From a paper:
Giardia lamblia (GL) is an anaerobic parasitic protist, which causes an acute human diarrheal disease called giardiasis and poses significant health and socioeconomic problems in poverty-stricken regions worldwide. As expected, we found that the GL ribosome comprises an extremely reduced version of typical eukaryotic ribosomes, missing nearly all of the eukaryote-specific rRNA expansion segments (ESs). In contrast, the ribosomal proteins are typically eukaryotic with some species-specific insertions/extensions.
Multibody refinement resulted in a slightly improved density map of 2.69 and 2.85 Å for the LSU and the SSU, respectively. Since the comparison between the GL rRNA and human rRNA structures is most relevant for future drug development efforts, we focus on their specific structural differences. Thus, the comparison shows that many rRNA ESs present in typical eukaryotic SSUs, which are located within the foot and head regions in the orientations shown in Figure 2, are absent in the GL ribosome. In the SSU, rRNA helices h6, h16, h17, h40, h41 and h44 are shorter than those of the human counterparts, whereas helices h9, h10, h21 and h39 are absent. Furthermore, the GL SSU lacks the human ES3–ES6 and its eS8 protein is truncated compared with the human counterpart, where eS8 interacts with the ES3–ES6, which are thought to be late evolutionary extension loops. Conversely, the GL SSU rProtein uS17 N-terminus is extended compared with the human uS17, perhaps because the human uS17 interacts with ES6, which is missing in the GL SSU. Notably an elongated density located at the inter-subunits fits very well with the structure of eL41 from the human ribosome. The cryo-EM structure shows that this protein is shorter than the annotated one and its start codon for translation may be annotated as eL41, which is part of the B3 and eB14 inter-subunit bridges. Superposition of the GL decoding center on the human and the L. donovani counterparts shows the structural similarity of the PAR binding site.
Residue numbers in the entry:
A (entry chain E): 2 to 259
B (entry chain G): 101 to 122, 129 to 170, 186 to 187, 189 to 231
C (entry chain L): 20 to 200
D (entry chain I): 2 to 39, 51 to 175
E (entry chain J): 2 to 167
The structure:
RNA sequence: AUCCGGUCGAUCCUGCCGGAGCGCGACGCUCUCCCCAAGGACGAAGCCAUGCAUGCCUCAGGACGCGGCGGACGGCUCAGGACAACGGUUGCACCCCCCGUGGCGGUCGCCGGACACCGCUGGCAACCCGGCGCCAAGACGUGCGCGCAAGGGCGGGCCCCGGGCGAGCAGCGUGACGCAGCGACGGCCCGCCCGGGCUUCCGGGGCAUCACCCGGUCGGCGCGGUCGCGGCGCGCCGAGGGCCCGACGCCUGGCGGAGAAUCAGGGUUCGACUCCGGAGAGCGGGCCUGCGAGACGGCCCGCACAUCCAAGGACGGCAGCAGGCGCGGAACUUGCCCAAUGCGCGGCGCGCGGCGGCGCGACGGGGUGCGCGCGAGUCAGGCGGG
RNA sequence: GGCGCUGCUGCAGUUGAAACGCCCGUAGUUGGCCCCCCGCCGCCACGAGGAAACGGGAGCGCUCCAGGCAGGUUGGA
């Protein structure tokens, strides 16, 4: 081409969006922002496609013009705004507060949370670097920037941020035996404990985890998010990160029409 | 494009000319539009352009669509600018405090 | 670096390599066949006039990945901006091994890499080879048949993207074999 | 126009290669400054903005005697030697790395301290000092350098021997 | 493009390789006599629908009795074959699938079911009655002679309450 | 997981010729009902009449105009190009990047004048323009401010090995230059994000009646140029580089993949067109504006073709949507609409796309009876639909 | 596809078409037996990571069907 892409065909949209192949040539293209294109969901795809508060695009706009939706405590008036992992989703007029996590099939789900919990956010430290006049900065998985961080915080740790001041009140270190959740790949969405860290000079570092039923699995270090120290700092869905096999899933499916 | 039929010669079907230092000049046409910038109405009326009462909302114009004077320093606009300056100082003060905290922290560590 | 410097008492004498490097530098100044004066960019050239010895006269570095710097580079007198130990380049990307096909160029060699290609219809293999150009620092010397390990760098010429970082000698007059590795 | 695209070169076996597109804008090159000695600097718009300064007709520079650390601003007097071509010396064209003669006046206040190179003090006692340009005048519009010393000084002094 | 370009379609029958073979030529018309078949295509369809369920079983039977693919797909195949009544409950072995014939498929047609319960005197009268919207399945009026009736929905085949025969 | 007819006076073989199945087009004949659905690609990337395909929001009743964002995305085609492109797999410690989302914000008293819309006059066949004059800004221009943009000299250890690495990388100090950007409604700058540029390894057509090929060709040194590395270019130095594990040359009615047709297993053939990537806009070149183009519903030139004209001049690009000519065996309406799916500005726009029309390319279901009730049609009301 | 008349699985070469007049010989292809419990290839298995549509395939009566992703706590494994 001669410049950036502004469209996204429906068959080319990410597969965990669960878009259906009829009823449209086009799909919404997420605007740049706190999250990337592949690992996100356009906000409209929650209000219209999922919760049916709106039923078309045009009337999905008017909900976001009068500012009925807060993301991390701020009203976003943009239908293709990228919302993603750990974002707080609060609709006041219906009194619904959610936290955006993954389910055991790598898709985004909303978990109900209490008013005592929606005032903070977990971020993953992506890098530490020296900015202007040699000052230290840290960057997160949300495209957030913090100057003068405490020297203990190192890369791959997670930090806890109050959602009004935008400052740090807690941090969790990446270690052996920490509770963790996988954010992408093919073990996305399930929760376990770290039991190995194998570094390969020049190449990717692999992590081996083990579920609460003891199933062991592997992935890359760029996909493991710490959610606490042997106890998750937040709430998690009812399945709690245990993935069935196809046979047990089939028997649970047979039981729904039963 | 194509240009310049002559440096005036026989070709031209038209000429444009202005009169300097004067059939004879008789008509005097009025100026349709009136000064609009705030200073434009202080040079007209000899008023100084430096005071703490520059409001100048005299409304005559001789009923001659055009007024809505520009560049007027009102009271709220003065407050706006003063507020922006008072916040551009607060940023620097809090920034220097944070730098001091971090230097002392590394000193303790 | 927890441990600190055990005690030999011939160290300061053995730093006569300083006068060594110094007189090599002053020999480069007399070869008036050259057009440019060659020097490392990491080194002042005012450190040679001094006598207190307090400052180093040659620059070198480590390349990582468990590959140690040869002493011939640390105590050499050559100038090479493309040497991975004493020049201005870096190693990153793929690391490979091969055999020296030809050493007829100026600080450049050809490397022969061998491999197998499976053809499924016939259920069999064919032997294949490719040639790769690589840069040769003076801190190594090689001949045809020797095994080398090369590592990827930024583009360096029309054909070169690798740099010799290890040598395994092979005796002359031995049967040449496929030798894939 | 001028391009640094590789599509016009033969392969490494000597074979001619075909053309599969027309010239792209991002592969352009421009003409060189050919900065003259003894003041204009033009501005060039580049990719994404990113102004480039391109010098024509520079006169002065800022120079450093590194060993004793005496830095002044001095006038470049003459280009005396160049490695690439003797055509670039005959014309007094300012490029990176060329050897010049600079004015000795600003450094005459450094004539007192001894234990300072006599191969530099005797240079100062005359009219000029041998120095080397260290910047790219076509890319930043500036011509600064350092004062030669060590075996480098001797190498260039024999290159300019009265022979 | 248009959206219709993304719609799928498929052929659902296979024609025989030698057309002019006498014994299957008359065996193919005894079938058109015992069932009110319009034309040979409705036989071809049947054989095609057999040839797939025969291909699955022979793939799983080559496997091992404890593999998950057998445990999953063979159970799915048997559970599907028991609801349509193409296979009966007493044969719950994957090896009982291979000895199946077309007639087992033809016996679960609505045209055949209504003949069995004697709603129609013959199969031709049954086809005519089907076209006349005179018969309902579970309170739902079904117009298709070729309709396949599940064993759940075979207790509940009647004349439609709205009808001229009510 | 199948064969059958044809050589003889008769017989057993080798061996081909012919028949029997599926798919894709074209031709012929014929056709009741309903659902789905391709449709000028096929050595003419030949030529085009006409209309439509890109607009939407700081300073006065409104227009108009100025200013701003977008027009580089979307649509079409397969001409070129065979160690390309393209597919998987690496890297940038050789790079650039609008919007959006976090940060950050220290810089050696309210200014000026003038341009368009518009008035008064004109030229010209028409295309298109001239002169004089009153008038604004979230437009310019200059700037009030706690010094800090680029580039440059010194600040490393002389077995071997945190700010941040596998890797001496990034910052800072200190001597010299320089005076950039942001400030008249406060933003220069920094991280991410998407996108791009190149780049490592493996795969990547046929012909030997094409056996030797190349000479910026292969490497080195130094400068220039570039967003940036690089024989990318230039000066100098050396003689390298590729090849029967098929180089070089020539040919292709050659776009690549995801895939598709056929059918025991192993295979054979095709990849115009839906998604992804590439390239082009009659053919060569050149360029401006912009974050982004070597843009063609932008500009300039040569060539080959057309257009209007008072003869002075002016002027064009359907491989966009319909439509036409030509060519061919071979391919549809010069319809209605932004209601949906999405994109730009926020309310509109949009031949993207949607809905009807023509449509036996092809798919799927049901009829022309049964032992006596239906469907195809007709007329009304619903439902659906901008 | 038939065609084992292109043959890797899997053709034919005494007489049906087909073994160079013969010997040497480089590239290529191929190479007896033996030590087990190290390294480096190949090879087998299991993982990680990257695209959907197509192709398989779990569940669901568009009246059936070619379809589609529905639906009555759900689901698109
Ligand atoms: K394209
Ligand atoms: K762009
Ligand atoms: K664009
Ligand atoms: K699509
Ligand atoms: K679609
Ligand atoms: K599409
Ligand atoms: K968008
Ligand atoms: K060196
Ligand atoms: K191999
Ligand atoms: K291979
Ligand atoms: K081989
Ligand atoms: K080179
Ligand atoms: K080169
Ligand atoms: K071999
Ligand atoms: K160019
Ligand atoms: K370009
Ligand atoms: K066969
Ligand atoms: K015969
Ligand atoms: K005979
Ligand atoms: K015969
Ligand atoms: K055509
Ligand atoms: K064509
Ligand atoms: K053809
Ligand atoms: K054809
Ligand atoms: K045509
Ligand atoms: K723009
Ligand atoms: K444009
Ligand atoms: K078309
Ligand atoms: K093509
Ligand atoms: K852009
Ligand atoms: K590459
Ligand atoms: K490569
Ligand atoms: K490559
Ligand atoms: K390759
Ligand atoms: K050939
Ligand atoms: K040359
Ligand atoms: K060069
Ligand atoms: K040259
Ligand atoms: K030469
Ligand atoms: K060949
Ligand atoms: K063609
Ligand atoms: K097969
Ligand atoms: K074969
Ligand atoms: K096969
Ligand atoms: K076969
Ligand atoms: K088509
Ligand atoms: K295409
Ligand atoms: K295509
Ligand atoms: K596409
Ligand atoms: K595409
Ligand atoms: K594309
Ligand atoms: K394309
Ligand atoms: K293109
Ligand atoms: K072209
Ligand atoms: K053209
Ligand atoms: K052209
Ligand atoms: K052209
Ligand atoms: K052109
Ligand atoms: K670009
Ligand atoms: K050009
Ligand atoms: K061009
Ligand atoms: K037209
Ligand atoms: K075409
Ligand atoms: K149309
Ligand atoms: K014709
Ligand atoms: K005709
Ligand atoms: K619309
Ligand atoms: K935009
Ligand atoms: K349309
Ligand atoms: K009736
Ligand atoms: K009726
Ligand atoms: K055959
Ligand atoms: K075959
Ligand atoms: K066969
Ligand atoms: K044989
Ligand atoms: K013969
Ligand atoms: K013969
Ligand atoms: K013969
Ligand atoms: K023989
Ligand atoms: K022979
Ligand atoms: K022989
Ligand atoms: K022999
Ligand atoms: K022999
Ligand atoms: K041999
Ligand atoms: K061999
Ligand atoms: K062989
Ligand atoms: K061999
Ligand atoms: K042998
Ligand atoms: K293997
Ligand atoms: K995708
Ligand atoms: K649930
Ligand atoms: Mg496009
Ligand atoms: Mg082009
Ligand atoms: Mg001279
Ligand atoms: Mg030579
Ligand atoms: Mg293809
Ligand atoms: Mg294709
Ligand atoms: Mg077409
Ligand atoms: Mg265009
Ligand atoms: Mg063009
Ligand atoms: Mg014809
Ligand atoms: Mg039907
Ligand atoms: Mg065969």
């Amino acid at each position: 081409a001669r410049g950036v892409r502004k469209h996204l065909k429906r068959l080319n949209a990410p597969k965990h969006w669960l878009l259906d192949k009829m009823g449209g040539i086009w799909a919404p293209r997420p605007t740049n922002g706190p999250h990337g294109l592949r690992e996100c969901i356009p906000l409209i795809l929650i209000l219209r496609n999922r919760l049916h508060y709106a039923n078309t695009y045009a009337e999905t706009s008017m909900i976001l013009q009068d500012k009925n939706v807060l993301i991390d405590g701020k009203p976003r008036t943009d239908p293709t705004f990228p919302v993603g992992f750990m974002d707080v989703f609060e609709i006041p007029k219906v009194h619904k507060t959610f936290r955006v996590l993954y389910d055991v099939k790598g898709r985004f789900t909303l978990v109900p949370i209490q008013s005592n919990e929606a005032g903070f956010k977990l971020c993953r430290v992506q890098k530490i670097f020296l900015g202007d006049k040699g000052m230290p900065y840290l960057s997160t998985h949300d495209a957030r920037t913090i100057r003068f961080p405490h020297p203990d915080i190192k890369t791959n740790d997670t930090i806890k941020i109050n959602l009004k001041t935008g400052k740090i009140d807690e941090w969790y270190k990446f270690d052996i035996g920490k509770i963790v959740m996988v954010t992408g790949g093919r073990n996305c969405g399930r929760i376990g404990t770290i039991q190995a860290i194998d570094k390969h000079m020049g190449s990717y570092t692999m992590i081996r985890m083990k579920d609460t039923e003891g199933t062991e699995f592997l992935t890359r270090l760029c996909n493991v998010f710490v959610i606490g120290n042997d106890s998750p700092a937040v709430a998690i869905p009812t399945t709690k990160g245990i993935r069935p096999d196809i046979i047990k899933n089939r028997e649970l499916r047979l039981r729904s029409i039963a | 494009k194509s240009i310049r039929g002559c440096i005036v010669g026989p070709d031209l079907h038209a000429l444009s000319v202005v009169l300097v230092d004067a059939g004879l000049t008789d008509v005097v046409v009025p100026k349709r539009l009136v000064p609009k910038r705030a200073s434009k109405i202080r040079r007209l009326f000899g008023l100084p352009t430096t005071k703490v009462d520059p409001k100048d909302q005299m409304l005559v114009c001789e009923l001659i669509l055009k007024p809505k004077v520009q560049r007027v320093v009102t009271d709220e606009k003065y407050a706006r600018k003063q507020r922006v300056i008072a916040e551009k100082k607060e940023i620097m003060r809090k920034s220097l405090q944070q730098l001091e905290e971090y230097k002392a922290l590394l000193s303790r560590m | 670096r927890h441990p600190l410097r055990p005690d030999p008492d011939r160290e300061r004498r053995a730093l006569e390599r300083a006068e060594n490097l110094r007189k090599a530098a002053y020999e480069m100044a007399e070869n008036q066949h050259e057009r440019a004066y060659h020097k490392q960019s990491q080194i002042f050239q005012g450190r040679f006039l001094r006598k207190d010895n307090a400052r180093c006269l040659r620059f070198y570095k480590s390349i990582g990945m468990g590959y140690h710097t040869p002493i011939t580079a640390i105590n050499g007198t050559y100038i090479d901006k493309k040497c991975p130990f004493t020049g201005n380049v870096s190693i990153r990307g793929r690391i490979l091994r091969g055999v020296v096909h030809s050493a007829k160029m100026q600080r450049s060699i050809i490397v022969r890499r061998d491999y197998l290609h499976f053809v499924q219809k016939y259920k069999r293999y064919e032997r294949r080879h490719k040639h790769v150009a690589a840069h040769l620092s003076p801190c190594f010397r090689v001949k045809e048949g020797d095994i080398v390990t090369i590592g990827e760098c930024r583009p360096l010429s029309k054909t070169i993207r690798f740099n010799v970082i290890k040598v395994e000698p092979v005796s002359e007059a031995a049967k040449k074999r496929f030798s894939p590795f | 126009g001028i391009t640094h695209d590789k599509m016009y070169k033969r392969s490494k076996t000597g074979a001619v290669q075909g053309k599969w597109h027309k010239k792209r804008k991002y592969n352009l090159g421009r003409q060189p400054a050919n900065t003259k000695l003894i003041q204009k600097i033009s501005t060039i718009r580049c990719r994404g903005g990113n102004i480039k300064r391109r010098a024509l007709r520079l006169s002065h520079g800022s120079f450093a005697w590194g060993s004793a650390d005496i830095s002044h601003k001095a006038r470049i007097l003459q280009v005396v030697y160049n490695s690439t071509s003797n055509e670039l010396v005959r014309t007094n064209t300012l490029v990176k790395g060329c050897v010049v003669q600079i004015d000795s006046a600003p450094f005459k206040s450094a004539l007192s301290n001894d234990t300072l190179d006599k191969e530099i003090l005797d240079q100062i006692r005359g009219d000029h000092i041998l120095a080397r340009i260290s910047s790219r005048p076509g890319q930043v519009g500036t011509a600064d350098g350092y004062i030669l010393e060590g075996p480098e000084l001797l190498f260039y002094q024999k290159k300019l021997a009265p022979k | 493009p248009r959206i219709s370009r993304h719609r799928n379609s498929s052929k659902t029958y296979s024609t025989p390789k030698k057309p002019f073979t006498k014994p299957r030529l008359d065996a193919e018309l005894k079938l058109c006599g015992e069932y009110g078949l319009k034309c040979k295509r409705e036989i071809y369809r049947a054989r095609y629908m057999l040839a797939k369920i025969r291909r699955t079983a022979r793939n799983l039977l080559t496997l091992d009795e404890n593999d998950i693919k057998r445990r999953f797909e063979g159970a799915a195949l048997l559970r599907r074959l028991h609801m349509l009544g193409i296979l009966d409950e007493e044969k719950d072995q994957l090896d009982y699938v291979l000895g199946l014939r077309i007639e087992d498929i033809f016996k679960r047609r609505l045209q055949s079911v209504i003949v069995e319960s004697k709603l129609a005197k013959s199969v031709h009268h049954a086809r005519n009655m089907i076209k006349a919207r005179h018969i309902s399945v579970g309170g739902q009026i079904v117009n298709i002679p070729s309709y396949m009736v599940r064993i759940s929905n075979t207790s509940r085949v009647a004349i439609a309450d709205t009808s001229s025969l009510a």
